[PDB]
From a paper:
To test this idea, we aimed to fix the CF1FO in its active, reduced state in the native membrane by adding tentoxin after the enzyme was reduced before the enzyme was extracted from the membrane. Our resulting cryo-EM densities imaged after the addition of tentoxin were overall well-resolved, corroborating the highly mobile nature of the reduced CF1FO. Our structure of the reduced CF1FO reveals that the tentoxin binds specifically to the α-βT interface thereby blocking the most critical and rate limiting step in the rotary mechanism: the opening of the βT site and the release of the ATP molecule. All three rotary states of the active, reduced CF1FO showed the density of the bound tentoxin ligand, and its binding site alternates with the rotary state. However, the reduced γ subunit does not maintain the β hairpin 1 structure due to the disconnection of the disulfide bond, and the β strands of the β hairpin 2 are shorter than those of the oxidized form. The shorter β strands have less hydrogen bonding between the two long loops to stabilize the hairpin structure, and as such the disconnected cysteines are more likely to destabilize the structures of the two β hairpins. The reduced cysteines may release the torsional constraint on the β hairpin 1, forming a one-turn helix, uncoupling the β strands of the β hairpin 2, and destabilizing the loop structures of the γ subunit. While in the reduced state, the βGlu412 is far from the γ coiled coil, which has less interaction with the central coiled coil and may result in less restriction for the central shaft rotation. An exciting finding is that the peripheral subunit a slightly moves away from the c14 ring when the enzyme is active, reduced state in all three rotary states. This implicates that the reduction of the γ subunit may have an influence in facilitating the rotation of the membrane c14 ring, thereby generating ATP molecules at a higher turnover speed. Moreover, the reduced γ-ε central shaft is slightly further away from the top of the c14 ring than the oxidized form (rotary state 1: 1.75 Å; rotary state 2: 2.55 Å; rotary state 3: 1.02 Å).
Author numbering:
A (entry chain e): 1 to 131
B (entry chain J): 91 to 111
C (entry chain a): 22 to 244
D (entry chain X), E (entry chain M), F (entry chain W), G (entry chain N), H (entry chain V), I (entry chain O), ...: 3 to 81
R (entry chain I): 30 to 62
Amino acid sequence: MTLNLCVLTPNRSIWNSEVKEIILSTNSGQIGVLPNHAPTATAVDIGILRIRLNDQWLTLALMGGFARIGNNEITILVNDAERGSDIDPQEAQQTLEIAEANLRKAEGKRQKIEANLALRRARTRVEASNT
Amino acid sequence: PIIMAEFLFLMFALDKIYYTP
Amino acid sequence: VGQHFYWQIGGFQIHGQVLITSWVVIAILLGSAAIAVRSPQTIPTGGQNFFEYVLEFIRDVSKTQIGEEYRPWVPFIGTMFLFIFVSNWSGALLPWKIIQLPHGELAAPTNDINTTVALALLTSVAYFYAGLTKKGLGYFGKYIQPTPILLPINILEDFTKPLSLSFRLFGNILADELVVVVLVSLVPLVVPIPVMFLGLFTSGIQALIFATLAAAYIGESLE
Amino acid sequence: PLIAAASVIAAGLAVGLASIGPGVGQGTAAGQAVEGIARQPEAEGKIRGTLLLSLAFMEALTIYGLVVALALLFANPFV
Amino acid sequence: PLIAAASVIAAGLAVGLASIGPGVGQGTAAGQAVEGIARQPEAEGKIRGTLLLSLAFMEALTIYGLVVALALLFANPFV
Amino acid sequence: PLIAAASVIAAGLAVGLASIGPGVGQGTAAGQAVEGIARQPEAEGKIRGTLLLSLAFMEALTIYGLVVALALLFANPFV
Amino acid sequence: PLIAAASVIAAGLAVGLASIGPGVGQGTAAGQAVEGIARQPEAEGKIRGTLLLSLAFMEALTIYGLVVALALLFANPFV
Amino acid sequence: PLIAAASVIAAGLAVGLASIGPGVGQGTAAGQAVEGIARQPEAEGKIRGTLLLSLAFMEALTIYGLVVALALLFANPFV
Amino acid sequence: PLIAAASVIAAGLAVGLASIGPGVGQGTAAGQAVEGIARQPEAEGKIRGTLLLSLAFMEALTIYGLVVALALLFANPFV
Amino acid sequence: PLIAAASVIAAGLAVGLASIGPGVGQGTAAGQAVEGIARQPEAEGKIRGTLLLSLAFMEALTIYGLVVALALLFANPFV
Amino acid sequence: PLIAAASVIAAGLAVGLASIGPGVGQGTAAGQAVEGIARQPEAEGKIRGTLLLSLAFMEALTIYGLVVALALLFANPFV
Amino acid sequence: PLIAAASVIAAGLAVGLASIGPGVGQGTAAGQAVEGIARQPEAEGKIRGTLLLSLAFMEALTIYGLVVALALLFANPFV
Amino acid sequence: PLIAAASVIAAGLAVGLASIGPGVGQGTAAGQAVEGIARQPEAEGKIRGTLLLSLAFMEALTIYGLVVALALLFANPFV
Amino acid sequence: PLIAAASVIAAGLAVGLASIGPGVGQGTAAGQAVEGIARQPEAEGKIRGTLLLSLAFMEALTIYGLVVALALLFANPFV
Amino acid sequence: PLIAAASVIAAGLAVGLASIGPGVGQGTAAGQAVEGIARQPEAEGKIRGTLLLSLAFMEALTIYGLVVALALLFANPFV
Amino acid sequence: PLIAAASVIAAGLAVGLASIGPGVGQGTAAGQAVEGIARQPEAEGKIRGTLLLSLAFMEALTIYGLVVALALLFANPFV
Amino acid sequence: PLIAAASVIAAGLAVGLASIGPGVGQGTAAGQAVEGIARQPEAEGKIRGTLLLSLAFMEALTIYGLVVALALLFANPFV
Amino acid sequence: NLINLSVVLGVLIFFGKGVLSDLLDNRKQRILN
């Protein structure tokens, strides 16, 4: 009743099941996909990939990557996608406080980009583990 | 004038008789 | 074509269209609301379903806009929605060319000055009162911290916004009256058939946009 | 006299400069609508909703102009 | 005199300037519609339905201008 | 007198140059609106609401012009 | 007399200002249509049909201008 | 006389040549606002607040034009 | 007579303003046609059909302008 | 004296030709500002601050037009 | 008298407001044609076929204007 | 005397045209300024500095328009 | 008298408005041609051929107006 | 008389048409300069240098217009 | 006489509208030519060659305008 | 006499038109110049030299306008 | 006499509409030339040579306008 | 007014209830299930 969806980290296929409604947080913002979407191959930011199983709305925790929409056979090549919600938010905020802390000490030019990406990944981790 | 007064009466009365139920 | 008044003196020269149209439209609106709220069931039955659908519409458009305390202004904005709705439908439907009046005409409440400027004035009184309520009593939203120039323009916009909404209602309902009167004055009414649909659509969405524009401005009063 | 001639010039130019704007208006609005229809064949109903709504508003613009010209021609107070 | 001259010149310019708007309108709209078809053939019917509705509305602008021009031409109550 | 001709020609120019402007505004507004519906339907209510609001403001501009247009056409104290 | 001259110049500017717009409209629509049929060879029939419908509505606008030009030219109830 | 009627001619011409500007501006702001409602529907409330600031300044512009546009017809301190 | 003067000026302006549209349309249309031929060397049959058909449609537009001019010039029912 | 009529026409044209430009100007400004707050949900304070400064300057432009037109209408040294 | 001078002014303006068109027409057509040439030179034959055909139709428009200007010059049926 | 009418119409057109250009100037300026503010949360200080310099310069241009209008109105050396 | 004066005004207007368009046309064709040549020089003979043919057709489009103006200045069979 | 009044209208139109273009030019230069500043915040010194140089050359254009207007107002060697 | 005044005004507007459009053409051609020079320094020679042939034929157009306008000025066979 | 008035109108109009175009010329030149400077601040010397060359040339355009205005106003051989 | 007034108006409009086009031309040429230098500063000499050639071609067009103006002003055979 | 208005009266009594009934059916099946 929907398009084929395969979320694929480098090492494995996370899960290749099909679900109805997906909100794809791109570099251009959130975009919703439909079953029988016309093919759009976009990018994906360090953000939130929300799905909809037509029975319950669920979020997926990913750390970036790339997406492709095809003839109802869509493939999303991600960086670090942990299936569903595997973590609880207490250790998430224990990672948020230390990421914002080490942002200060990591102040050199490369450490700017490094701490900023660690921050954008901790923020997507916590806003994925809210549910 | 009396149109404003009648609008006010209509709205207070209709509120009381019509909204919370 | 006769829109001024008739000489039913009551202390001052008062408009006749204003009086009779607004009085009868308020009367039929309260007759619709009151007789069907006498015996309501817990299930949304025949008319109660329609009335509760209207009221949850007002609940949504009042919950999304203003702030944390829109519910006491839900009666005001909801009676405003109902007034504009039924007055637009009565102007589109209720026959007032077969009935003749010796001194003037009788088409709708918003055709004249009084029952649009009264809506503007009541909303503006509500905005000033709600601003002196939610904010302090020394200086309302006029006071300029960041810019040393916006002090007069603050009261100037607080003066020119209600009249602007009034002129919106003017340019809607007077235009609709012109459409209907010239379109029935063309020839027998075989021509108004496609135009009636556009008039109905515009009248309904006119009611909706007046509702959300009242909501936005009590939102500014809250802000 | 001259008032009817000037009035009907006003009506003709009124209809022309009514059809100026809503033309390109409905053009861009409906073009984006029919493109986004191919982009999403699932919210076709809501695309039709916003499309009919906005197209009807631009038809309302041109009927504003049409009715002020129609009152200049047929139902006018002066001449 | 000058009244019928004004009437016919008003009708000519009224049917004239009624065109530039809906022309580029229908142009861009049909371009985005055919691009939608070429990007996906599956929603041809909904594409062409919203397309024809918008086209009947640009043509509604056009026939509005035309009926003012023709009632200006033939059934001119002034002269 | 000719003052009526002056008033009505000013009315025609007023309503025409009024109906020119906000039509393409409504157009590009509705166009980015339908592109937004095709992009993400999860805020369909907000897209519909802001559509209603901004189209209302644009028709409001045109009728801000139209009230003076009808004051010069129909209800004039000058003539 | 001047009325005939006014009717002929009205027909001339009628076909002119009626022919300015749908030209560029037809151009944009057909350019994107040929780009679409160059992109995909499957939907050619539906593309050509819908383009024929839209381009013929544009021709309908221009022939509305043409028949105002012809009615002002041949049979005017003023001249 | 013509010297006083130039005031109402200037009134019609003024409102006509004033109202054109805010239409495309309201349309651009509305389009980018609803495109933002499409892109990020979470911060859309703050976007609506900035849209309220935009509506405030746009309505300020247009109503401040309308006050003097009506002052042309109402108050003639010249004559 | 001034009738024939305005008539031939009408033919001149008719062909002038009937030639501005189809030129500025066929330009982008045929440019995108060659662009699509350069996109895919297989759909050239349908691209040729659509391009020649639409460029002949704008040919038809400019010859509508030309036949208005030639009816004004050769076969003038008034003069 | 004709100086009063020239003054009132100059005031009307000043208001119109000062209301043309800044309208689409502030539209572009507010459009890119709402697309910006749509991109980032964080820098909204500086967005509102800089947009308020630029909108105040554009209001200053239109109010420049309005106050010189007011010095034309009420407080003019010539008439 | 006035007839031949009016015919000659009409011919001059006709060829001028005609050549303001297909100039930019042929320009954009040839620009996109040569861009497609240096993008895909695989279909040079069909590219040049469409190029010559398009440029010939623009030449057809401009020579329509040219032959009607020539008929306004040489064989004026009035004078 | 005609010199006062000339002075006031010249001042009105001067202020109108001087408000025309910097409108869209400041429009694109504020649009790209807030787009930069939105893309980067770092350099609000110097972005505001350069934006304020450009705004003060363009408003110096529109007060060039204002001072020439005022010198025509009050401190008119001819009357 | 006035006929030869009208002929020379017509010639000047003809060459002016026949010189506007082809300049822009030749320019955009040249720009796209040189962009394509920088992208890929492999068909330099073919590129030169197609571009000189396009420039020949645009210079034909303007030499049309030039020879009609020389028929207006040197050998006018009316005067 | 007429010489001084024409000098006044000339000065007003001069300052207007020399104020329009600098508006849009300075605005687009300012917007793109601020976007470039957001692109790199490192060399804002040189960015400011070239921005102020171009802004001051455009301001030199506006004060060229200002000084010819002031010579047309005060230091008029004719009258 | 009026014939020589016609000649001089025709030559002025002839050089004017000979100068309007070729400026835009030469600009877009030159800018995209230097864009190609910086894109690829391998096609440099025939980049130069196409630039030269193109700007030379556009110069042929503007000198066509120059020579017809100087034929209106210095060697007039009529007056 | 009318020669002085015609001269002063031509001079004001001349400096206006000769200023208005190079304005947005220098504006787009400066916009792309600073956007390129923030692209790479290495070539800043040659960048500034070339933009100075072009800004000197557009200022040469506007001082050509200025010097013909001065030659028309002060050192005029006729009046 | 009227001949000198016509000659000076033609001269002023000649300088204006002569400097108009080269302004935007030179501007676009400069902007894309400096963006090219910022893209790759390798061929700075070739780029500067083509830039001076292009800007000098536009200077040639405005020098054509300048020498036509100087013929109208100083060595005018008519006046 | 007789047959002119009758088509939109029929459109009301049928189509308005038809478009209200499906959304009411969705909300009733929601609350009941």
